[PDB]
Amino acid sequence: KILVELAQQQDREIGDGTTSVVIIASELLKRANELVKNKIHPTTIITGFRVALREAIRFINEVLSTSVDTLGKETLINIA
């Protein structure tokens, strides 16, 4: 049901991508379930994901770029 409400939160912000968000949260629970069998407490499992999320947003900053390759070549024509 949290995943159902997750699709509502995804539709009210971006409006698209509910398919990929559910697959992410599904695999994260499977990975965290194996950490429980590893005798790792779930509180640190929660905090361990939040620390990785803070860096993940910072890592996207070196990924993301503005509009480029529109002069001297065309990457947009492959879309059309």
């Binding site: 997750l6 559910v22 947003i57 480029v68």
Partner: protein, 67 residues
């Protein structure tokens, strides 16, 4: 990507050649920026943020009382 991220942080490079994704029509690895597959940053950042908060809400349940 692992080989392209070796010389990238050192600020010394022969050729970078990063950002190679999956082309499922021809079944080969190509550059997605040149192929034209792009998603806005606001979509990917809020996706990992929303998927994590939903995963935490599940991991915070140690007990369930069902009437």
């Amino acid at each position: 990507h692992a080989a392209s991220q070796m010389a990238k942080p050192e600020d010394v490079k022969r050729r970078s050649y990063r950002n190679y994704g999956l082309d499922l029509i021809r079944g080969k690895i190509v550059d997605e920026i040149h192929a034209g597959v792009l998603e806005p940053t606001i979509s990917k950042v809020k996706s990992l943020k929303s998927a994590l908060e939903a995963c935490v809400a599940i991991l915070r349940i140690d007990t369930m009382i069902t009437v």
